[PDB]
Amino acid sequence: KPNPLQDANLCSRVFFWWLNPLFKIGHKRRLEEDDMYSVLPEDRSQHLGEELQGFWDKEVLRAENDAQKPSLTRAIIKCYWKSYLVLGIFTLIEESAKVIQPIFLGKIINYFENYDPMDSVALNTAYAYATVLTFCTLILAILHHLYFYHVQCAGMRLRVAMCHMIYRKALRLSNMAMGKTTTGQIVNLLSNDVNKFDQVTVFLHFLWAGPLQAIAVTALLWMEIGISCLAGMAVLIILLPLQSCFGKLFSSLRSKTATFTDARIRTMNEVITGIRIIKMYAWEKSFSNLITNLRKKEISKILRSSCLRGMNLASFFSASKIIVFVTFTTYVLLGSVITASRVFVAVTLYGAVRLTVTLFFPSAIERVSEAIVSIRRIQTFLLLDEISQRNQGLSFTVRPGELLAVVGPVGAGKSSLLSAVLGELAPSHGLVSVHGRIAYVSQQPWVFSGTLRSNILFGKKYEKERYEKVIKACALKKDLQLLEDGDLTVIGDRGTTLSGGQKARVNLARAVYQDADIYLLDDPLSAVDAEVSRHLFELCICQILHEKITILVTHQGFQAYKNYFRAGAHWIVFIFLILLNTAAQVAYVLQDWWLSYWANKQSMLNTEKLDLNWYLGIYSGLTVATVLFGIARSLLVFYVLVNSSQTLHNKMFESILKAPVLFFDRNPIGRILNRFSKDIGHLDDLLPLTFLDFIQTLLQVVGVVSVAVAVIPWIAIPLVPLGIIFIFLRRYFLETSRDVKRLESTTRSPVFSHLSSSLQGLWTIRAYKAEERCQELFDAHQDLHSEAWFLFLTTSRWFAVRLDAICAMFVIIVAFGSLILAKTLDAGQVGLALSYALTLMGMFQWCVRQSAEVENMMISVERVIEYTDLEKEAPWEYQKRPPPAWPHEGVIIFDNVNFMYSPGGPLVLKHLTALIKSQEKVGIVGRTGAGKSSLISALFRLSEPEGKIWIDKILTTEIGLHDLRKKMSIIPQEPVLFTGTMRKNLDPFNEHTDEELWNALQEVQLKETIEDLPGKMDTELAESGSNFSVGQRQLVCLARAILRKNQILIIDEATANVDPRTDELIQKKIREKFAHCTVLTIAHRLNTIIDSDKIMVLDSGRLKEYDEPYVLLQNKESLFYKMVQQLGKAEAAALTETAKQVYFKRNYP
Ligand SMILES: CC(C)CCC[C@@H](C)[C@H]1CC[C@H]2[C@@H]3CC=C4C[C@@H](OC(=O)CCC(=O)O)CC[C@]4(C)[C@H]3CC[C@]12C
Ligand SMILES: CC(C)CCC[C@@H](C)[C@H]1CC[C@H]2[C@@H]3CC=C4C[C@@H](OC(=O)CCC(=O)O)CC[C@]4(C)[C@H]3CC[C@]12C
Ligand SMILES: CC(C)CCC[C@@H](C)[C@H]1CC[C@H]2[C@@H]3CC=C4C[C@@H](OC(=O)CCC(=O)O)CC[C@]4(C)[C@H]3CC[C@]12C
Ligand SMILES: CC(C)CCC[C@@H](C)[C@H]1CC[C@H]2[C@@H]3CC=C4C[C@@H](OC(=O)CCC(=O)O)CC[C@]4(C)[C@H]3CC[C@]12C
Ligand SMILES: CC(C)CCC[C@@H](C)[C@H]1CC[C@H]2[C@@H]3CC=C4C[C@@H](O)CC[C@]4(C)[C@H]3CC[C@]12C
Ligand SMILES: CC(C)CCC[C@@H](C)[C@H]1CC[C@H]2[C@@H]3CC=C4C[C@@H](O)CC[C@]4(C)[C@H]3CC[C@]12C
Ligand SMILES: CC(C)CCC[C@@H](C)[C@H]1CC[C@H]2[C@@H]3CC=C4C[C@@H](O)CC[C@]4(C)[C@H]3CC[C@]12C
DSSP 216-269: HHHHHHHHHT-TTHHHHHHHHHHHHHHHHHHHHHHHHHHHHHHHHHHHHHHHHH
Residue 365 in contact with ligand 2 by CB distance below 6 A: yes
Beta bridge partners of 968: 1048
> How far does residue 219's CA lie from ligand 5's centre (Å)?
9
- 309 vs 252, 652, 692, CA distance in Å? 13, 27, 10
Last residue of a domain, one of 553, 572, 599: 553
Per the CB < 8 A criterion, the answer to whether 918 and 951 are in contact is: no
Q: Looking at ligand 6, which atom is closest to the CA of residue 590?
A: 10
Domain-located, residue 955: yes
Name the residue with the closest Cα to ligand 7, atom 25: 707
| Pair (1102, 1121) in one structural domain | no
Residue 959 and residue 811: Cα distance in Å, rounded? 74
3-state SS assignment for residue 1: coil
Domain-located, residue 267: no
Residue 414 and residue 442: Cα distance in Å, rounded? 12
The helix (run of H) or strand (run of E) holding residue 895 is strand 892-899
Domain-located, residue 199: no
Give binding residues for ATP as ranges: 408-415, 926-933
Q: How many residues does the chain have?
A: 1149
Half-sphere exposure of 570 (CA within 13 A, CB side): 1
Residue 99 and residue 105: Cα distance in Å, rounded? 11
Domain-located, residue 694: no
Task: Of 821, 847, 850, 848, give the one whose Cα is nearest residue 833.
Answer: 821
- 937 vs 887, 906, 1105, CA distance in Å? 19, 15, 21
| Pair (1030, 1100) in one structural domain | yes
| Pair (1145, 1091) in one structural domain | no
Residue 550 and residue 518: Cα distance in Å, rounded? 6
> How far does residue 678's CA lie from ligand 4's centre (Å)?
28
State how beta strands 518-522 and 438-440 pair: parallel
Residues with CB under 6 A from ligand 3: 582, 586, 590, 593
Q: Which ligand is nearest to the CA of 88?
A: 5
Domain-located, residue 544: yes
| Pair (1096, 1128) in one structural domain | no
Residue 658, phi then psi, degrees to nearest 5: -105, 0
Residue 208 and residue 205: Cα distance in Å, rounded? 6
**Which residues constitute the domain of residue 1130?**
1109-1149
In angstroms, this model's resolution equals 2.9
Name the residue with the closest Cα to ligand 5, atom 20: 213
Residue 876 and residue 965: Cα distance in Å, rounded? 10
DSSP string computed for 509-529: HHHHHH--SEEEEES-SSSS-
Beta bridge partners of 403: 550
Task: Of 173, 197, 154, 198, give the one whose Cα is nearest residue 42.
Answer: 154
Max CA distance (Å), the chain: 134
Per the CB < 8 A criterion, the answer to whether 321 and 189 are in contact is: no
Task: Of 434, 441, 410, 400, give the one whose Cα is nearest residue 420.
Answer: 434
What method was applied to determine this entry? cryo-EM
DSSP string computed for 634-645: HHHHHHHHHHHH
Q: Is the dihedral of CA 605, 611, 616, 619 positive or negative?
A: negative
Residues whose CB is less than 8 angstroms from the CB of residue 192 and which lie 6 or more positions away in sequence, other chains included: none
3-state SS assignment for residue 845: helix
Residue 124 in contact with ligand 1 by CB distance below 6 A: yes
| Pair (458, 487) in one structural domain | yes
Q: Looking at ligand 6, which atom is closest to the CA of residue 625?
A: 1
Residue 83 and residue 538: Cα distance in Å, rounded? 63
Beta bridge partners of 518: 438, 549
Name the residue with the closest Cα to ligand 1, atom 30: 128
Residue 106 and residue 121: Cα distance in Å, rounded? 18
Residue 585 and residue 589: Cα distance in Å, rounded? 6
Beta bridge partners of 893: 915, 950
Residue 125 in contact with ligand 1 by CB distance below 6 A: yes
Q: Which of 72, 91, 369, 377 to mutate to test ligand 2, by most ligand atoms within 8 A of the CB atom?
A: 369
Q: Is the dihedral of CA 890, 895, 900, 902 positive or negative?
A: negative
Residue 92 and residue 620: Cα distance in Å, rounded? 38
| Pair (939, 1062) in one structural domain | yes
Residue 922 and residue 1082: Cα distance in Å, rounded? 9
Q: Looking at ligand 6, which atom is closest to the CA of residue 622?
A: 8
Domain-located, residue 908: yes
The helix (run of H) or strand (run of E) holding residue 842 is helix 827-868
Residue 1040 and residue 1043: Cα distance in Å, rounded? 5
With b for 16 or more beta-carbon neighbours within 10 A and e for fewer, the 640-669 pattern comes to bbbbbbbebbbbbbeebbbbbbbbbeebee
Give the single-character DSSP code of 881.
P
- 1105 vs 242, 389, 786, 1117, CA distance in Å? 82, 77, 70, 11
Q: What angle do CA 436, 440, 445 make, to 5 degrees?
A: 160
Q: Looking at ligand 5, which atom is closest to the CA of residue 223?
A: 1
Last residue of a domain, one of 553, 571, 602: 553
| Pair (1026, 1123) in one structural domain | no
Per the CB < 8 A criterion, the answer to whether 105 and 340 are in contact is: no
Last residue of a domain, one of 521, 553, 585: 553
> How far does residue 700's CA lie from ligand 7's centre (Å)?
12
Domain-located, residue 962: yes
We report the CATH number of the domain holding residue 961 as 3.40.50.300
Residue 383 and residue 389: Cα distance in Å, rounded? 16
Question: Cα 464 to the chain's mean position, in Å?
Answer: 44
Task: Of 923, 919, 915, give the one whose Cα is nearest residue 948.
Answer: 915
Residue 948 and residue 939: Cα distance in Å, rounded? 11
Beta bridge partners of 970: 1050
Domain-located, residue 1123: yes
| Pair (1067, 982) in one structural domain | yes
| Pair (1118, 1039) in one structural domain | no
Name the residue with the closest Cα to ligand 1, atom 20: 125
Residue 961 and residue 958: Cα distance in Å, rounded? 9
Q: Which ligand is nearest to the CA of 706?
A: 7
> What total of structural domains would you count in the chain?
3
Task: Of 292, 269, 286, give the one whose Cα is nearest residue 987.
Answer: 286
Task: Of 915, 914, 928, 925, give the one whose Cα is nearest residue 1135.
Answer: 925
Which one-letter amino acid corresponds to residue 270?
E
Task: Of 1047, 1052, 1142, 1144, give the one whose Cα is nearest residue 1093.
Answer: 1142
- 605 vs 150, 337, 598, 601, 602, CA distance in Å? 54, 12, 11, 7, 6
Beta bridge partners of 949: 894
| Pair (1117, 1069) in one structural domain | no
Residue 97 in contact with ligand 1 by CB distance below 6 A: yes
Give the single-character DSSP code of 30.
-
| Pair (1018, 1113) in one structural domain | no
Q: Which of 89, 94, 99 to mutate to test ligand 5, by most ligand atoms within 8 A of the CB atom?
A: 99
Residue 563 and residue 566: Cα distance in Å, rounded? 5
With b for 16 or more beta-carbon neighbours within 10 A and e for fewer, the 153-166 pattern comes to bbbbbbbbbbbbbb
Residue 236 and residue 691: Cα distance in Å, rounded? 27
Name the residue with the closest Cα to ligand 6, atom 1: 587
| Pair (923, 1037) in one structural domain | yes
3-state SS assignment for residue 978: coil
Residue 114 and residue 439: Cα distance in Å, rounded? 92
